[PDB]
Amino acid sequence: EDVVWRWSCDNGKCVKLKNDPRSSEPALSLEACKMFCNEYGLLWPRPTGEADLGNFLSKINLNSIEVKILKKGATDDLMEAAAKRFKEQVSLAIPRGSTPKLTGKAVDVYLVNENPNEKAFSLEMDESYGLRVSPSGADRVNATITANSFFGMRHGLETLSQLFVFDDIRDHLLMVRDVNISDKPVYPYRGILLDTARNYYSIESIKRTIEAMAAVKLNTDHWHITDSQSFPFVTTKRPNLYKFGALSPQKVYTKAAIREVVRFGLERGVRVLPEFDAPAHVGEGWQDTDLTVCFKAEPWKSYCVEPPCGQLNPTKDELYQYLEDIYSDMAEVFDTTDIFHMGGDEVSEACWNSSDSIQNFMMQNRWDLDKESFLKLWNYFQQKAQDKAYKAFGKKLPLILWTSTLTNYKHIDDYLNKDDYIIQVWTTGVDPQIKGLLEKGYRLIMSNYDALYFDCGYGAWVGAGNNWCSPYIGWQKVYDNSPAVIALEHRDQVLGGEAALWSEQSDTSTLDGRLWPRAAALAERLWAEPATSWQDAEYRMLHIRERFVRMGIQAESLQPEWCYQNEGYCYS
Ligand SMILES: *[C@@H]1O[C@H](CO)[C@@H](O[C@@H]2O[C@H](CO)[C@@H](O)[C@H](O)[C@H]2NC(C)=O)[C@H](O)[C@H]1NC(C)=O
Numbered sequence: 001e002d003v004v005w006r007w008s009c010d011n012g013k014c015v016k017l018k019n020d021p022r023s024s025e026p027a028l029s030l031e032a033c034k035m036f037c038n039e040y041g042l043l044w045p046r047p048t049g050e051a052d053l054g055n056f057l058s059k060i061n062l063n064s065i066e067v068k069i070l071k072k073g074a075t076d077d078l079m080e081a082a083a084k085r086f087k088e089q090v091s092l093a094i095p096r097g098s099t100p101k102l103t104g105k106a107v108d109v110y111l112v113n114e115n116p117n118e119k120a121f122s123l124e125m126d127e128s129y130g131l132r133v134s135p136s137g138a139d140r141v142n143a144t145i146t147a148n149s150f151f152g153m154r155h156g157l158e159t160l161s162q163l164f165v166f167d168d169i170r171d172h173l174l175m176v177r178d179v180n181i182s183d184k185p186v187y188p189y190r191g192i193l194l195d196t197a198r199n200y201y202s203i204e205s206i207k208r209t210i211e212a213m214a215a216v217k218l219n220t221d222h223w224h225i226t227d228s229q230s231f232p233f234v235t236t237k238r239p240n241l242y243k244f245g246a247l248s249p250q251k252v253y254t255k256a257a258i259r260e261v262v263r264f265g266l267e268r269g270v271r272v273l274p275e276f277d278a279p280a281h282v283g284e285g286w287q288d289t290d291l292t293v294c295f296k297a298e299p300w301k302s303y304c305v306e307p308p309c310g311q312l313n314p315t316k317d318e319l320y321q322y323l324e325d326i327y328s329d330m331a332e333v334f335d336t337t338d339i340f341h342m343g344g345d346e347v348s349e350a351c352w353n354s355s356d357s358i359q360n361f362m363m364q365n366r367w368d369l370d371k372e373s374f375l376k377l378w379n380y381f382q383q384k385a386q387d388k389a390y391k392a393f394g395k396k397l398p399l400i401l402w403t404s405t406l407t408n409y410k411h412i413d414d415y416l417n418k419d420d421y422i423i424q425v426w427t428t429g430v431d432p433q434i435k436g437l438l439e440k441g442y443r444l445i446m447s448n449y450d451a452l453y454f455d456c457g458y459g460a461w462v463g464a465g466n467n468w469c470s471p472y473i474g475w476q477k478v479y480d481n482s483p484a485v486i487a488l489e490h491r492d493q494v495l496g497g498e499a500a501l502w503s504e505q506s507d508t509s510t511l512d513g514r515l516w517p518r519a520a521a522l523a524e525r526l527w528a529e530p531a532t533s534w535q536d537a538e539y540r541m542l543h544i545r546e547r548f549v550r551m552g553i554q555a556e557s558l559q560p561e562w563c564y565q566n567e568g569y570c571y572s
């Protein structure tokens with residue numbers, strides 16, 4: 001069957017009109033109308049520099065797309081892999097069940113990597129790129145991507161793939177004829193936190209996530225790989241941790257699997273950042289070691305935030321031999337990360353107090369048993385754990401901790417320093433802690449629970465009702481949450497943001513809907529920091545959702561497809 005409608009741009013809105021045969025004007029398909037009716041067309045995220053999309057499209061032979069790398073170097077296999085994936089991303093323009101006519105011009109993609117040896121992740125890496133498309137001769141297209149590193153190069157490959165549209169009226173694959181794009185991100189840390197300990201996530205689902213992250217230029221997969229409920233990380237030096245801590249023998253993450261994920265991410269510009277939360281958020285796996293306290297302590301509401309309770313015992317010297325082995329095994333397989341997340345989630349003082357060995361350790365020292373003295377013990381633990389982390393990675397590298405009582409800006413300088421520790425922020429953007437931390441020079445990663453906790457809104461998992469941070473955070477609230485508004489003058493200290501998917505109520509089955517397309521809103525906010533609000537990005541957000549679905553992502557549905565086909569009629 002054949003498409004019946006056509007679309008025509010009118011005041012920045014594609015209006016659906018009947019495709020009457022008695023017309024001399026060529027019918028426009030829906031996406032062809034959108035590509036030029038919209039200020040930024042079908043691009044997500046919108047570029048930050050020049051965004052010249054011209055006015056016309058060119059028909060393209062899908063089979064005549066060839067990529068040529070002009071500068072060889074150490075990133076040859078990376079550029080070759082990113083070039084091979086480029087054609088699959090072009091086929092994403094075509095709806096499933098439709099076949100384009102193998103007709104039209106040929107495309108020449110010219111990749112220019114100005115530093116073809118650089119392939120390390122760093123907060124200072126250059127993700128910029130230049131993209132220009134123009135006719136070449138009489139039957140060819142010259143698409144030239146120029147970037148200072150491979151990572152910017154494959155960002156430009158991503159943007160180039162979004163410049164293809166499928167004409168489902170005529171079954172023609174089209175491309176923007178004359179493009180001039182210069183682009184670079186506003187923030188260097190654009191991440192997603194995946195909790196794979198409160199519930200297991202298949203390795204295939206994790207790599208599907210990375211695929212969708214690269215599609216919107218997110219670059220950091222924060223792998224919250226352990227917690228109280230399970231220990232799926234296969235640590236070779238301490239094998240009892242995962243053998244006793246895993247939910248099942250197959251719900252683990254082997255060295256080979258992690259190397260797969262890490263390499264999969266590197267090929268797509270995604271740094272895989274591992275976290276070992278400590279000294280709280282520990283439990284299963286540590287049985288028979290006597291290195292924890294209050295594991296499964298009852299009543300749990302007296303001893304921890306959520307069951308099961310359990311914290312490391314920092315007074316045992318053997319603890320830091322365990323941690324050193326854990327970090328070392330992590331550093332072996334997570335060999336592309338430049339940052340290590342050490343958790344620092346809120347420690348329960350009632351739990352540490354209920355241990356005699358801990359109380360004796362503090363009486364033996366010059367400490368009492370008050371709130372201030374358990375801050376002594378926490379900093380005592382963090383100081384030694386930090387030493388082992390440095391040794392394990394064979395290098396002093398940035399460490400991340402959460403906002404907590406340990407990182408309260410009023411006394412954080414007693415324990416940490418702004419050069420060694422990055423602070424991940426879960427508090428709201430109007431919380432005084434953010435201003436105080438910024439004035440002390442600390443660098444921040446924004447994960448405000450009122451706009452970036454992707455677990456909020458569902459039913460309660462203890463008792464009845466809804467979970468603690470309900471209501472559900474729509475993509476509009478994710479888009480409008482701006483770190484520049486939150487940090488103001490200190491915005492350069494903000495390294496970026498990170499959508500947090502805690503997995504008390506999420507696993508392999510719910511992964512796609514939890515993250516997409518809401519994380520794409522965070523992707524544009526962190527890449528472009530637009531002065532405009534979500535309503536200006538609404539039409540493009542609807543398209544990027546459809547693109548996710550085409551990739552095989554079970555993305556959440558935002559609006560009726562009728563609204564997508566009838567821009568302007570769905571408003572409030
Ligand atoms: C493809 O297009 C690119 C950019 O439009 C061309 O590269 C430019 O070449 C001119 C001279 O011919 C230089 O002054 C510019 O600095 C180049 N731009 C960049 C970004 O490198 C390229 O020559 C074209 N290739 C073909 C085969 O037509």
Ligand SMILES: COc1ccc2cc3[n+](cc2c1OC)CCc1cc2c(cc1-3)OCO2
Pocket residue numbers: 305306345346402426462468
């Ligand atoms: C780190 O930020 C976090 C992280 C996790 C948090 C978890 C919970 N709370 C704040 C949190 C928080 O804000 C402090 C509020 C109380 C609460 C009750 C619960 C629950 C979870 C939580 O599940 C069972 O009943």
Ligand SMILES: *[C@@H]1O[C@H](CO)[C@@H](O)[C@H](O)[C@H]1NC(C)=O
Pocket residue numbers: 349350353369370371
């Ligand atoms: C620790 O336990 C003792 C009881 O021996 C109590 O007096 C003290 O207040 C407790 N500390 C905290 C922080 O609750």
